[PDB]
Each structure stands twice: as C-alpha cells, then as structure tokens.
C-alpha cells in the first residue's frame, strides 16, 4: 500500500474549511526526539502533535520502544486550506504506523481527533469532510464511534460510497487505521 508512517487525513482547517492532508512520518535511529515540519508556524498544531506524541510514548506498550528512534513528522497540505485543526489522532496513527513498520490501509482516510485526556472526539463537519474524501478518491474511512450519531446528517449517496470502520479510543484508532481490528 503506502509507505509506513504515511497516511491521509481530512479535517477542518483553521479557517473552518475541510481539507485533505498527508502525514509523512520518518523514523530513524535516535533517542526519542520529535521533529516537525509543515506546521504553518502554528503553536496550536505543534501542541496537537505534541499531545499525540505524548500519548504515543505513554501507550506504546499496548501496541517496541520510541526512545530508541527519532521521529520527523512532515505535514503536506494538499488542497491549500491552511493549518489543520485536527492533528492529534492522525498524528498518533502515523506515529504508531511508523514504529511498527505497518502500512495504513490502502485508500483509507483517517478522520476525527483526540482530546488531551485521551478520548476521541467526533469528526467536525463530517458531511463536508466526507464530501472532500469522496472527491479525493478515498474508498475507506475510519471514524470515531460517536460520529455514528452524525450518519443521518450525511447524504446517503455520499455515505454509502465508503467502506466505513469505527474506533472507540486512540489505540483502537491505530488498530482500525492499520487494518487489524
């Protein structure tokens, strides 16, 4: 499929516009250092990626040691929408994919986000995000469980275009994005 540590995500930009982004995480031999690029000089994006990396360090046993590798997360803005406001959960998925050397499911977009407390949050404007996902050729989507309540907000022609999986927590999100749960 795709290179491990690479994944597509779709989310509302800082200006409220749905956009498609590609996370490109590189893993090397190191000490556990997180470097970032493409974060638009945004302290908010950096803090989100940091929350993701902290959760990664704290729960990497449930998925191997991050302290023996160095990570560089580049973020590619594919549709000129600005900074992505929902980066924690996609970054966690990209971190775990990079570590385990497992590729994210082919033609899948990961949607949703993660709070500091470690709970997943429903996709913001899921109808618009999935419209972007369909227009971008995505075939599968991984969604937070709560977003099921928003299924009736999505036009049925659009929602039934996807093969959809649901995750209950960040680790479950990792397993759904890699294709093993």
Author numbering: 496 to 558, 562 to 679
Q: Can you quote the paper on this entry?
A:
Bacteriophage exclusion (‘BREX’) systems are multi-protein complexes encoded by a variety of bacteria and archaea that restrict phage by an unknown mechanism. The final gene in most type 1 BREX systems, termed ‘BrxL’, encodes a large protein (670–700 residues in various species), with much of its sequence predicted to adopt a fold corresponding to the chambered ATP-dependent AAA+ protein family, which are involved in a wide variety of cellular functions throughout all biological kingdoms. In this study we have demonstrated that the BrxL phage restriction factor is a multimeric DNA binding protein that displays ATP-dependent assembly on double stranded DNA.
To better understand how BrxL’s C-terminal domain relates to those or other protein domains (and to provide a starting model of that domain for subsequent CryoEM studies of the full-length protein) we expressed, purified, and crystallized BrxLC. During the final step of purification by size exclusion chromatography (SEC), we observed that BrxLC eluted at a retention volume consistent with a monomer rather than as a higher order multimers (eventually shown to correspond to hexamers) previously observed in studies of LonPC and RadAC. We obtained crystals and solved the X-ray structure to 2.25 Å resolution. The crystal structure contains 4 subunits in the asymmetric unit, with no obvious higher order symmetry. The backbone atoms of BrxLC superpose well with both domains despite low amino acid sequence identity (BrxLC shares 14% identity with both domains); superposition of BrxLC with RadC generates an RMSD value for 148 structurally equivalent α-carbons of 2.3 Å (P-value 8.97 × 10−14); superposition with LonPC generates an RMSD value for 172 structurally equivalent α-carbons of 3.3 Å (P-value 3.02 × 10−12). A structure-based sequence alignment of the BrxLC with RadAC or LonPC does not demonstrate obvious conservation with previously visualized DNA binding residues with RadAC or with a protease catalytic motif as observed in LonPC. BrxLC’s distinct solution and assembly behaviors, in conjunction with the low sequence conservation relative to LonPC and RadAC, indicate that the BrxLC domain may have adopted a distinct structural role in the function of BrxL as compared to the same domain in LonP or RadA. In contrast, purified BrxLC is monomeric in solution and (in the context of full-length BrxL) appears to mediate dimerization of heptameric (without ATP) or hexameric (with ATP) complexes through protein-protein interactions with another BrxLC partner. In the DNA-bound dodecameric complex, BrxLc domains are far removed from dsDNA occupying the central pore and do not share significant conservation with LonP residues essential for protease activity or with RadA residues involved in DNA binding. These observations imply that BrxL’s CTD has evolved a distinct functional role from the LonPC and RadAC domains.
